Design an enzyme around this catalytic site. Structure first.
Site, PDB file in Angstrom:
ATOM      1  NE  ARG A 182      -3.439  -0.243   0.289  1.00 29.08           N
ATOM      2  CZ  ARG A 182      -4.261   0.048  -0.854  1.00 29.08           C
ATOM      3  NH1 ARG A 182      -4.404  -1.030  -1.908  1.00 29.08           N
ATOM      4  NH2 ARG A 182      -4.671   1.330  -1.081  1.00 29.08           N
TER       5      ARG A 182
ATOM      6  CG  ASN B  56     -10.434  -4.032  -7.731  1.00 30.41           C
ATOM      7  OD1 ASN B  56      -9.894  -5.176  -7.754  1.00 30.41           O
ATOM      8  ND2 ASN B  56     -10.068  -2.887  -6.973  1.00 30.41           N
TER       9      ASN B  56
ATOM     10  CB  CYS C 292       1.561  -1.704 -12.153  1.00 29.77           C
ATOM     11  SG  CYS C 292       1.405  -1.033 -13.916  1.00 29.77           S
TER      12      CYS C 292
ATOM     13  CG  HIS D 130      -3.490  -2.729 -10.148  1.00 23.78           C
ATOM     14  ND1 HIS D 130      -3.697  -2.395  -8.763  1.00 23.78           N
ATOM     15  CD2 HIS D 130      -2.259  -2.175 -10.510  1.00 23.78           C
ATOM     16  CE1 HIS D 130      -2.882  -1.379  -8.333  1.00 23.78           C
ATOM     17  NE2 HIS D 130      -2.078  -1.479  -9.302  1.00 23.78           N
TER      18      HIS D 130
HETATM   19 MG   LIG Z   1      -8.043  -5.969  -8.545  1.00 20.52          MG
HETATM   20 ZN   LIG Z   2       0.515  -2.708 -14.910  1.00 17.43          ZN
END
Ligand SMILES: [Mg+2]
Ligand SMILES: [Zn+2]
Ligand SMILES: [Mg+2]
Ligand SMILES: [Zn+2]
Ligand SMILES: [Zn+2]
Ligand SMILES: [Zn+2]
Lengths: 162, 162
Positions: free
Chosen positions: B60, B118, B104, B97
């Site tokens: 985090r 998500n 990333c 993500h």
């Molecule tokens: Mg995710």
């Molecule tokens: Zn990425």
DNA sequence: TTGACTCTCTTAAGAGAGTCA
DNA sequence: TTGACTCTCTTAAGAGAGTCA
């Protein structure tokens, strides 16, 4: 308890008690535009729940038996799997609702798998929509679909590529 | 409150700094047996991380800017979405993500959606394997597949029907 | 104003254990 | 022995806020 005989007796008493829970019919999406019917054996909403059962959380229950003057207690959905390995690939095995119905204790609606496998069934397209689970889903997951994404990938400048 | 121009300036500073993160080329499954390539802009494993960035947990981070003597702080992946609605259908929006690579910070690899949406991308078959996400996945989810179920649905007696 | 640490919290799929009667 | 309550914990996708120099 310790002996295979004692464990079998625990499973048999649990099945007999859960077998008397009300049977509630649920019609469910299977994927592929098809619908099926599941028969869930639902633990009551309030006490009494059945011999050996008690509620430890809003949708959590435990099964309790006294063997050799000792109390043995298990998560209420774990009892069918007491003779199975309790881990897989170093991950804890969990009771996983194929019917996505917490109150249901029908062992024909449960499997025993990692928490990741368990969770992932929420998004499965279902047995008639492309489920690839080796232990097949009974229905399309309740969260399957296009989602409700508010914003997609984006940049203000020219520093990034996909 | 920060003006929309002040917010755009935060997004621009964030993009400038993240654009200088190491860019790592990853070959990834797309579904349908096809392979593709993603370019992730990865925050360093240890301090220093980049101007404005600090680690608040194992994976985090937060971004911090001080404007007119007031300290403002945001989750490090939330900055691309500061001009977007922050909830939808009564659910908080989260940075999601598409590359499934937590370090990333490439904004072309992020979207802004409920925590359920998500999570569900972990099991998606991918953009060439049947993804139905309206904001399309960039790759097959890392947890897609047959699973590793230890035990399936079963009963010892005849108390149950499916 | 900035960096590098510290702490606890959310969610929704799941757990274990103690206090009384 | 059995029943009906109480409490906190686990995981892996995610968060907000404090302290010190
Ligand atoms: Mg995710
Ligand atoms: Zn990425
Ligand atoms: Mg489940
Ligand atoms: Zn069921
Ligand atoms: Zn499935
Ligand atoms: Zn997808």
């Amino acid at each position: 308890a310790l002996t295979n005989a004692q464990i079998l007796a625990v499973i048999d008493s649990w099945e007999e008690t859960v077998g008397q829970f009300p049977v509630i019919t649920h019609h469910v999406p299977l994927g592929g535009g098809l619908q099926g019917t599941l028969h869930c054996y639902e633990i009551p909403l309030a006490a009494p729940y059945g011999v050996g059962f008690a509620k430890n959380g809003p949708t959590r229950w435990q099964y309790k038996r006294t063997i050799n003057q000792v109390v043995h207690r298990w998560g209420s959905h774990t009892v069918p799997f007491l003779l199975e390995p309790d881990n897989i690939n170093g991950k804890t095995c969990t009771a996983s609702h194929l019917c996505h119905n917490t109150r249901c204790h029908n062992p024909l609606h449960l499997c025993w798998e990692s928490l990741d496998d368990n969770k992932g069934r929420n998004w499965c397209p279902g047995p008639n929509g492309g489920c690839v689970h080796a232990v097949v889903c009974l229905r399309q997951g309740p969260l399957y679909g296009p989602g409700a994404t508010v914003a997609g990938p984006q940049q203000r400048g020219s520093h990034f590529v996909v």
